[PDB]
Paper text:
Type IV-A [name]-Cas systems diverge from this general mechanism, using a nuclease-independent interference pathway to suppress gene expression for gene regulation and plasmid competition. Here, we present several cryo-EM structures of two evolutionary distant type IV-A1 and type IV-A3 complexes (from Pseudomonas oleovorans and [name], respectively) bound to cognate DNA targets with and without [name]. The structures reveal multisubunit DNA-surveillance complexes that intimately recognize their DNA-targets to form an R-loop structure. Our results support a model in which DNA-binding is achieved analogously to type I Cascade, while recruitment of [name] differs mechanistically, even in closely related subtypes.
Cryo-EM grid optimization and exhaustive data collection yielded a sufficient amount of particles to reconstruct three structures of the [name]-bound type IV-A3 effector complex, with [name] resolved at ~3 Å to ~7 Å in three distinct states (states I–III). However, density was lacking for the arch domain in state II and only present at low resolution in state III. Similar to the type IV-A1 structure, type IV-A3 [name] is recruited to the NTS at the belly side of the complex. We next compared the three type IV-A3 [name] states, based on a structural alignment of the complexes. This revealed that the Cas8 and Cas5 contacting C-terminus, and Cas7 palm binding segments of α-helices 21 and 22 of [name], do not rearrange between the states. Thus, the C-terminus and α-helices 21 and 22 appear to anchor [name] to the complex. Between states I and II, the HD domains maintain their relative and overall conformations, while the vFeS moves towards the center of [name]. The arch domain becomes stabilized in state I, as corroborated by the absence and presence of cryo-EM density in states II and I, respectively. Examination of the cryo-EM map also revealed low local resolutions (4–7 Å) for the vFeS domain and NTS exiting the HD2 in all states. This limits the accuracy of structural interpretations and suggests an inherent flexibility within these regions.
Author numbering:
A (entry chain F): 1 to 235
B (entry chain A), C (entry chain B): 1 to 342
D (entry chain M): 105 to 227, 333 to 624
Write the structure that this text describes.
Amino acid sequence: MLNFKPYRVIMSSLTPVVISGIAPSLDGILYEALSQAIPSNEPGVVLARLKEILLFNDELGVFHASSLRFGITPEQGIGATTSMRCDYLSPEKLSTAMFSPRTRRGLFTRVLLTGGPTKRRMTTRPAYSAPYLTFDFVGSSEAVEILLNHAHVGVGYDYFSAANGEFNNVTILPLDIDTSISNEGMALRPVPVNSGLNGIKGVSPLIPPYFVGEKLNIVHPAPVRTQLISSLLRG
Amino acid sequence: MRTLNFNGKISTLEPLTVTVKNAVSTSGHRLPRNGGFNAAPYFPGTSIRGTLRHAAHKVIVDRVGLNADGKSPFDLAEHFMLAQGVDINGEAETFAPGEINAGAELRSKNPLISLFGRWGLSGKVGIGNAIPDGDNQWGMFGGGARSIMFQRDESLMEFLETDQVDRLERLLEEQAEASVDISQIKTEQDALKKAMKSADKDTKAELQIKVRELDEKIQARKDQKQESRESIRRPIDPYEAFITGAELSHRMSIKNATDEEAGLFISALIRFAAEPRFGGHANHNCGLVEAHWTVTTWKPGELVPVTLGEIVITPNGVEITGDELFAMVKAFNENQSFDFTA
Amino acid sequence: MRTLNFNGKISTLEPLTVTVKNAVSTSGHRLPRNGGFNAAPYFPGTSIRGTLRHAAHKVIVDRVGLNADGKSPFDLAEHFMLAQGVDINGEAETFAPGEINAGAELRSKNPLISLFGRWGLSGKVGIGNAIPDGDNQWGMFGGGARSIMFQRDESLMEFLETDQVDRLERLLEEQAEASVDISQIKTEQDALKKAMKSADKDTKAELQIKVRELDEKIQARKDQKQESRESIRRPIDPYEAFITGAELSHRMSIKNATDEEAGLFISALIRFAAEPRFGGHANHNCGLVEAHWTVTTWKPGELVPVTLGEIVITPNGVEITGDELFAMVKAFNENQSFDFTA
Amino acid sequence: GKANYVSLEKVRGLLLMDEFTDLDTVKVLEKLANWSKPLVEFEEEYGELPAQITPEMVTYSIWDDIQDIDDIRLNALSANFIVTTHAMVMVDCMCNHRILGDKENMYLIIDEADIFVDMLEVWIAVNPFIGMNVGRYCTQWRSALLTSATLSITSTPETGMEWLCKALGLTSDTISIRKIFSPDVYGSMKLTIAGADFPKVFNDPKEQIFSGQWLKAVVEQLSCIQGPALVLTASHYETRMIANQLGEVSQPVYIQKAGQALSEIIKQYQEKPGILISAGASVGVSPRGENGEQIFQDLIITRIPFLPPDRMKAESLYGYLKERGYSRTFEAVNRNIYLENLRKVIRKAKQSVGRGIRSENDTVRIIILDPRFPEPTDLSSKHRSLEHIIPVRFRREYRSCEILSPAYFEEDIQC
DNA sequence: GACCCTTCGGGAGGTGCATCCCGGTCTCGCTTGGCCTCC
DNA sequence: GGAGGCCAAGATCTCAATTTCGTACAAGAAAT
């Protein structure tokens, strides 16, 4: 319960952003941030508190929080990087000080790092490295600024583990028109199909967290969307 | 159950470098950039997270100690569960995927797994990238060359018999021959790179396959060398590292943390300060850091940070500040309920 | 096993200089820079680490014993593996990844390889870069100019026969004519290199060719100089060095150092103190340093490290103060179970 | 001070006698002998100011002290609302144990505390962290209130006031509050900033040479102004070069000579508003008219007043951190001092912008001719903090601004 | 026992010569059976 | 004598290429 204004938030991208198929929505970032602020893994309370700082579309069931849109400058644009998690089996990790390996003839059975359940996992994931990430939302600017600046939330995938999509210099600027759900009929967020907004068909829950609950048919924008930083700051 | 946000600065005592497959190309070793070569590099949060997970694993093993037999109680399966987080024996609590809050029993019984998750169980410790604050805080360090020891100092030739001064003469003649051959082979290779630039497409694929034949010829010339296999007078490629005394901003956070899990994290930080090394090139002492972390938490029921204390890691010592941090550390130390096992 | 951090200062007795292929360019000799052209130069940890590794190799050669007439009982492969970590034979036991206690037997039998590492074996010793203390403290030393000995003082010309005098005449006339021709060619070359700044990529190819051909013209013009290939009288480009008395903060670490390995390291510092030379330009006595290190060990899990002692290397001697440093040195000197052979 | 920084034993010098035939307001001569009271009311009585300037009354007790000066201190102390200078509050705590005794009768209110800190590091220096001292002083009183119009680097309290949290040594636990109060509707403001393309201010900064192209651009934009304006240059040297390059085509150009007094040019400017090029100056002043009105619709900040690099401070702080034992490189200390100087730059430019608006009806056109001021579109510019000079309530006008020499003003097809 | 009265102008370079060259690594992110020991 | 435990082969290939932060002013003292 609070007055809500249409704001656009633009953050300087520090890390490549792993997009999990559907573009990361600002409501999901805010739901992680409120899941931390009030420690809660229960979705209901975090959703309730998110409604206090973000506008929620009852007729659509979605938050007024547009999906990620990369802000590309004339110097740096959207780039194709690989977020690469590699297991590092250090000589200290492969030592008897930490564990008792199976022994034969006093020789310690070496770990098969090439293949098998004890291999060196080399997980490469497409990531997009653009200078800025911008979201549009209708909500309380102070609360969202506090969350985005002093909470451990990133954009994309596995920021809580891979620190992908770390951002800083969060700037919130007021908008004149609500471009959080819709823009000239083009969906700017995961919306239900019945909304009549045209986009890319997919299967996902509408409200965060986007990995729980029944995954229904939705229309979501292009996972990678780019705009000039000048056009984003035009407002 | 408080979300401890640690925000703070890592000052680089000795250059901070990391090798990443995408960042490193044939052009040379570069830090991850999140853009082009002009962008500001970042030390990945993955390397710091792995270092702190290894430190936490060392803390856990020391707290558990060894058996009466002098062997660690952890087997390969438990060791990989605590270090890498992946189940090797196929024996793990496969919680329902729709239950965000699952594993409370395992989270309580294993605080290491709680902080740093396993597969199928989300972790509670989120480590961030060490973001530099400046504009010119990185550079080409290391490199140099592997000078031949006997062409630099002649005192070292009074300790070799003639049968080895002739093996030295033979290895240097082999090195010079091989370097000349490899030089001309690389010259032909680059001319082929030029013909790929042309890409007239008549026989481009064959030009690529003959380039591959040429690399094989490089490996053949470099197997003909029967005294040495690699040229010892090697110019070492520099690696990109953050400059000495680089202020990198770091955000870490334990979400919904028990006093025991937070205490385990602080003990991992305390043990990590024994060898505060991030990243590689430890031969050049790279990775030595001193870092101060302001431990804040969220006020119950509001969006306000309250500062609980500071964790100042320095070569002079670890300065844990704040009574609640000490309470967390003592709570983790004193709890005789952890069973770091199946 | 203890983790020893030698934190200390390298004071400069004579300028400390090093030519790293990365740092230097056609603009002149520059010290390796701390990440940027307008940055404080640092003395690379690579040069210090190589000097200390060669000092430790000489320590080992002395400790085993110079038999025969001074020939050491080690082959060339062993000397290379001990001093540069390169195995020319390829018989070095490559530790396949996943090998538990990788090289623990080799580490126990070869303390030197354990300290300074090898390929596939992590070096316990990490020798950090020497960062200067305070602005300036670097300068363009060396320099000067070659002058013809016989044009400086005429007395030496009484030691030259007539034919040698006419030889000097021809040599100087040749030097003058070659200088004028080469200088005109170089004026064309630098005008061309000024045309680089108008950097149209399509032209750059034609300019690199049209400048490397003019440099081959320079080489051919020099090659027809019958008397002297190179001009004898020529200004020496100065080299960048840390000034005399410069204070360079140095950090060295030995991870999990046994008393034997740490004793080997302290003996390497002792023998290095005999010739405390770092870098090059040793013709101008560059590199002579006096360095003092405070050895601090850090038991993991302890909030503070304890000070084992202080190593002072000075022209008047080596002052190793501390019960634990002497213990390490005696233990290394008294352990007869080191195998440095293949 | 001491009355109007004067004495009482030797007032007889400026009594009636032939030495000076001031005459005019003869009464003052006989009343001032027993005018214990301070400087200000001297003006309220009369504007004449005879016997030439008498700034400190033809010298008085610069450090020689006066007799029965205590009575003025008592008149301050028993008086409820003590008004002093920052000078008295620091001499009290550095010079001698305590100049002015206090125990639950006194309450520091350090207004414009930003410059109370920025000058603190000049007294001797903050090389030994002298700041710590004054921090205990604020604690030692019942409560110290540090306020300023520029007591922030960012619009966020806890991120921007951390230079106060880090210089005086006062920390969140002992900090009563950390807040920024900005009005929303206070005045109006059109922003015009020089872009990246704009000619570089310094052809070579070290030896302080100003590039001629930038001079030509600055004079061009100055002459294009159609009304009275206030040009806040950074150095009196910049004041002199800009005055030299100007052809006085505009209404009278008033120049602040190196080491002059601003208020004389202020009252030179009230009689005939025009173009006033006054470097330094400011310190919380405004060329307001007589009844009070914005008499300069334009305010030209030629360059952000970037503080010179101070090797003395770098080497001193490195010395103190090397004797204290902190293992930080000299380059790290250079970066820290550079960041601190950048913060003081932002504060100074916030004062400069504050010189434009002083009333709710003021409408100021701020002209930034510096090519290093961050463009709205260039969010990755090095000096990204420097838009915090603009108040939050005009940040829309920062985002909707006129750029004189913008860059990359084309349309990129990879949108 | 009180001041005097503070000088000009010269004239400010010329050359020479700006090196040679090394020598640029291994890897590895998977599974399977064959062979070899061996509980 | 069936369980580990180490070691060699499986045919193919994608692609990308760099040149230097910030340059001052005040006002105001019961002093170190």
